[PDB]
Amino acid sequence: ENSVAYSNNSIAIPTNFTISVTTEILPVSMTKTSVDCTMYICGDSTECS
Amino acid sequence: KGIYQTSNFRVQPTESIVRFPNITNLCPFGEVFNATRFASVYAWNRKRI
Protein backbone atom coordinates (compact mmCIF):
# COMPACT_ATOMS: atom_id res chain seq x y z
CA GLU A 1 0.00 0.00 0.00
CA ASN A 2 1.11 3.57 -0.79
CA SER A 3 -0.97 6.73 -0.23
CA VAL A 4 0.55 9.24 -2.70
CA ALA A 5 1.52 12.50 -0.93
CA TYR A 6 -0.75 14.69 -3.13
CA SER A 7 -1.78 18.22 -2.16
CA ASN A 8 -3.07 20.97 -4.52
CA ASN A 9 0.38 22.68 -4.91
CA SER A 10 2.82 19.69 -4.56
CA ILE A 11 4.76 18.11 -7.48
CA ALA A 12 7.49 15.44 -7.57
CA ILE A 13 10.11 15.78 -10.38
CA PRO A 14 12.79 13.14 -11.18
CA THR A 15 16.38 14.35 -10.62
CA ASN A 16 18.09 11.25 -12.07
CA PHE A 17 17.07 8.17 -14.11
CA THR A 18 17.94 4.56 -14.88
CA ILE A 19 18.17 3.17 -18.39
CA SER A 20 16.32 -0.15 -18.09
CA VAL A 21 16.76 -3.04 -20.52
CA THR A 22 13.77 -5.38 -20.25
CA THR A 23 13.16 -8.58 -22.27
CA GLU A 24 10.03 -9.45 -24.24
CA ILE A 25 9.85 -12.95 -25.72
CA LEU A 26 7.29 -13.83 -28.42
CA PRO A 27 6.55 -17.05 -30.31
CA VAL A 28 6.62 -16.58 -34.11
CA SER A 29 6.24 -20.05 -35.71
CA MET A 30 5.13 -23.62 -34.99
CA THR A 31 7.02 -26.64 -36.33
CA LYS A 32 5.77 -26.93 -39.98
CA THR A 33 4.12 -30.32 -39.51
CA SER A 34 2.60 -32.38 -42.33
CA VAL A 35 0.91 -35.81 -42.15
CA ASP A 36 0.42 -38.64 -44.62
CA CYS A 37 -3.20 -39.27 -43.51
CA THR A 38 -3.40 -42.76 -45.11
CA MET A 39 -0.07 -43.81 -43.52
CA TYR A 40 -1.27 -42.60 -40.10
CA ILE A 41 -4.73 -44.24 -40.35
CA CYS A 42 -3.88 -47.30 -42.54
CA GLY A 43 -0.04 -47.49 -42.94
CA ASP A 44 1.11 -50.67 -44.75
CA SER A 45 -2.54 -51.88 -45.29
CA THR A 46 -4.37 -51.64 -48.65
CA GLU A 47 -7.30 -53.53 -47.04
CA CYS A 48 -7.62 -50.47 -44.74
CA SER A 49 -7.00 -47.85 -47.51
CA LYS B 1 3.98 -20.62 -60.80
CA GLY B 2 4.69 -22.39 -57.49
CA ILE B 3 5.12 -25.73 -55.70
CA TYR B 4 2.33 -28.32 -55.18
CA GLN B 5 2.16 -31.51 -53.03
CA THR B 6 1.00 -33.88 -55.82
CA SER B 7 1.60 -37.21 -54.01
CA ASN B 8 3.27 -39.00 -51.06
CA PHE B 9 5.70 -41.87 -51.81
CA ARG B 10 6.96 -44.86 -49.79
CA VAL B 11 9.70 -47.44 -50.42
CA GLN B 12 7.83 -50.76 -50.70
CA PRO B 13 9.45 -53.66 -48.74
CA THR B 14 11.80 -55.73 -50.94
CA GLU B 15 11.56 -58.96 -48.85
CA SER B 16 9.55 -60.57 -46.01
CA ILE B 17 11.53 -62.26 -43.17
CA VAL B 18 10.29 -64.51 -40.32
CA ARG B 19 12.45 -65.29 -37.25
CA PHE B 20 11.93 -67.74 -34.35
CA PRO B 21 14.26 -69.52 -31.83
CA ASN B 22 16.30 -72.69 -32.50
CA ILE B 23 13.70 -75.49 -32.99
CA THR B 24 14.48 -77.63 -29.86
CA ASN B 25 12.21 -79.75 -27.57
CA LEU B 26 10.09 -81.85 -30.01
CA CYS B 27 7.46 -84.45 -28.94
CA PRO B 28 8.56 -88.17 -28.72
CA PHE B 29 6.58 -89.62 -31.71
CA GLY B 30 9.08 -92.54 -32.00
CA GLU B 31 7.79 -93.75 -28.58
CA VAL B 32 4.37 -94.47 -30.27
CA PHE B 33 4.68 -94.72 -34.10
CA ASN B 34 8.16 -96.42 -34.08
CA ALA B 35 7.51 -98.53 -30.90
CA THR B 36 8.52 -102.24 -30.73
CA ARG B 37 4.92 -103.20 -29.69
CA PHE B 38 1.30 -101.97 -29.35
CA ALA B 39 -1.52 -102.87 -26.88
CA SER B 40 -4.48 -105.25 -27.54
CA VAL B 41 -7.41 -103.93 -29.67
CA TYR B 42 -9.70 -104.44 -26.58
CA ALA B 43 -7.24 -102.45 -24.37
CA TRP B 44 -5.73 -99.51 -26.38
CA ASN B 45 -2.98 -97.67 -24.41
CA ARG B 46 -2.68 -93.84 -24.14
CA LYS B 47 0.39 -91.54 -23.87
CA ARG B 48 0.72 -87.70 -23.81
CA ILE B 49 1.90 -85.24 -26.53
Side-chain angles (χ1 to χ4, degrees), chain A residues 1-43 45-46 48-49, chain B residues 1-23 26-30 32-35 39 43:
Chain A
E1 178 168 327
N2 187 20
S3 57
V4 188
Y6 172 45
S7 63
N8 71 349
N9 71 353
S10 180
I11 191 174
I13 300 193
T15 67
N16 202 347
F17 61 86
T18 51
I19 307 301
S20 187
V21 180
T22 75
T23 290
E24 178 166 31
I25 301 125
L26 299 171
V28 178
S29 64
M30 305 178 74
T31 48
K32 289 170 61 180
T33 304
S34 183
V35 176
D36 190 12
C37 61
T38 301
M39 190 161 169
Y40 179 83
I41 297 176
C42 287
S45 186
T46 295
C48 183
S49 179
Chain B
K1 175 164 56 170
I3 180 174
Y4 305 92
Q5 186 159 355
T6 68
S7 182
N8 305 322
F9 98 103
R10 181 182 307 93
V11 173
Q12 297 301 104
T14 53
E15 287 79 26
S16 304
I17 71 171
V18 183
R19 300 293 288 174
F20 302 127
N22 296 23
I23 197 64
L26 295 82
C27 260
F29 299 152
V32 182
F33 305 145
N34 309 82

